[PDB]
Amino acid sequence: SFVKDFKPQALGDTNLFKPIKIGNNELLHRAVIPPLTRMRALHPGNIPNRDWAVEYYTQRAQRPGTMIITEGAFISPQAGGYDNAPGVWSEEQMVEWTKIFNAIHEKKSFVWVQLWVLGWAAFPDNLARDGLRYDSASDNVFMDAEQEAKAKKANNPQHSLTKDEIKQYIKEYVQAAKNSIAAGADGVEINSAHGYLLNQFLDPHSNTRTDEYGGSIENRARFTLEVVDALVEAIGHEKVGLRLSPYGVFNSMSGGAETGIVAQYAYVAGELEKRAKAGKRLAFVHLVEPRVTNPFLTEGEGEYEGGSNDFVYSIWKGPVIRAGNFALHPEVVREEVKDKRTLIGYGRFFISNPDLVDRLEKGLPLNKYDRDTFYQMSAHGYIDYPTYEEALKLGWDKS
């Protein structure tokens, strides 16, 4: 069915539908598909689903000039920990990724691959199964109760990365970025948000190191900046974007309770723009909004008013994508896009509406999303959401 008490608003007379150039890509509009894990990848091998992947993406790449940011993908075996999330380190993985990339392109849309590294968010059992470590910045702070229960049951303790293992992850980043480009992706996105490894180093609560990787705004931000600097040399700055979540609390991150949280992030921005002046300006900066501090909280739940993302605009002068409870607040997006370099990432509503863009343009009703199939091994709740026409044919009230 459609969203019940939702009063849609046509957004075609806004900047959301004005073209803009991101990297080498020329989008026909500014409503992007943010990275979304759906757990349909095949085990073993973390192979992208060969039965439904192309169809799912293809349905979403229907409105021409759309920028699609893929589900997070592990850059390596030690970077993962989820059996059904896809990888981007093997041939078997890349063969299926090329098919995907082609279909999106055939529909005249673009595709950026999110490079993923779990850190303490990965299941220790899975890693221990395959003889892998349970990595993280520190080893005297854990994610949560069950995460430590799992870790010990499987006798796979949290391991503080050495400077050499940190370098190894950087190797793995470059390579994954190359195979993504080599396979035909328009560029990659560095996931340095939602509490995964990179964020785990940025954050003062999770990072209690004393070396060159801990102890100061400069040191915490070091691992993140070294990936940006490594990927920029391997595939070029206009094929590299960074995703951050300043006020995120997901996966045990500090957020607005950390009095120095803003200073930590203003520092990352300042350095990104520094490089921008040196010619090397990243394709974008993706920003998860405080509106949502936890993706698995209903729209409206986990809203942080004590903080804002606006400060980034003062430092970074490039394109900035914003994701966070925008679908049901067109009146908010209206104001937000009045700014000239801002894109809106729609997540939960891009799952249920493969034709979201047109619905957004025309202020047409939205399809309710089924929270239960987000992470299901099924095609249902995956590729079977109907477009407006079909919902009308189904009679989701209007026959």
Ligand X SMILES: Cc1cc2nc3c(=O)[nH]c(=O)nc-3n(C[C@H](O)[C@H](O)[C@H](O)COP(=O)(O)O)c2cc1C
The distance of closest approach from Cβ of residue 367 to ligand X in the complex, given in angstroms and rounded to an integer, is 13
- Choose the catalytic residue: 169, 196, 213, 382: 196
Q: Which is nearer to ligand X, 126 or 191 (CB)?
A: 191
What span, in angstroms and rounded, lies between the C-alpha atoms of 30 and 21? 10
Nearest to 124 by CA among 96, 144, 103: 144
**Which residue among 323, 337, 343, 356 contacts ligand X (CB under 6 A)?**
323
**Minimum distance of ligand X from residue 36's CB (angstroms):** 4
Among 14, 15, 25, 37, binds ligand X (CB under 6 A): 37
Among 206, 254, 325, 352, binds ligand X (CB under 6 A): 325
Nearest residue by C-beta to ligand X? 347
Under 8 Å between Cβ of 72 and 114: yes
Contact between 60 and ligand X per CB under 6 A: no
Q: Which is nearer to ligand X, 23 or 347 (CB)?
A: 347
At 100 the three-state DSSP class reads: helix
% helix, strand, coil for the chain, step of 5: 35, 15, 50
| From 117, 232, 288, 356, residue interacting with ligand X (rule: CB under 6 A) | 288
Write each residue from 215 to 254 as x if it is in contact with ligand X (CB under 6 A), else as -, in one continuous string.
----------------------------x-----------
Q: Are 119 and 81 in contact (CB under 8 A)?
A: no
Q: Stretches 34-42, 137-145, 169-177, 386-394: which one binds ligand X (CB under 6 A)?
A: 34-42
Closest to ligand X by CB, 34 or 241: 34
CB 173 within 8 A of CB 146: no
Could you say whether residue 35 binds ligand X (CB under 6 A)? yes
| Options 87, 195, 295, 319; binder of ligand X; rule CB under 6 A | 295
Map the footprint of ligand X across residues 142-201, applying CB under 6 A.
191, 193-194
Do 28 and 66 touch, CB atoms closer than 8 A? yes
Q: Is 327 a residue that touches ligand X (CB under 6 A)?
A: yes
Q: Using CA atoms, how far apart are residues 177 and 117, in angstroms rounded to an integer?
A: 13
Q: Assess whether 196 carries a catalytic annotation.
A: yes
Closer Cβ to ligand X, 5 or 164, answer by number: 5
Those residues whose C-beta lies under 8 Å from the C-beta of residue 42, and which sit 6 or more positions away, are 48, 49, 50, 84
Tell me which long-range contacts 56-62 makes (C-beta under 8 A, separation of at least 24): 56/382, 56/383, 57/100, 57/103, 57/104, 57/111, 58/103, 58/104, 58/107, 59/354, 59/383, 60/33, 60/350, 60/354, 61/103, 61/104, 61/107, 61/109, 61/111, 62/107, 62/109, 62/354, 62/355, 62/357
| Using rule CB under 6 A, residue 113 touches ligand X | no
Shortest separation between residue 375's beta carbon and ligand X, angstroms: 7
* Interface residue list for ligand X (CB under 6 A): 34-37, 71-72, 114, 191, 193-194, 243, 288, 292, 295, 323-327, 345-349, 374
> Catalytic residue positions?
196
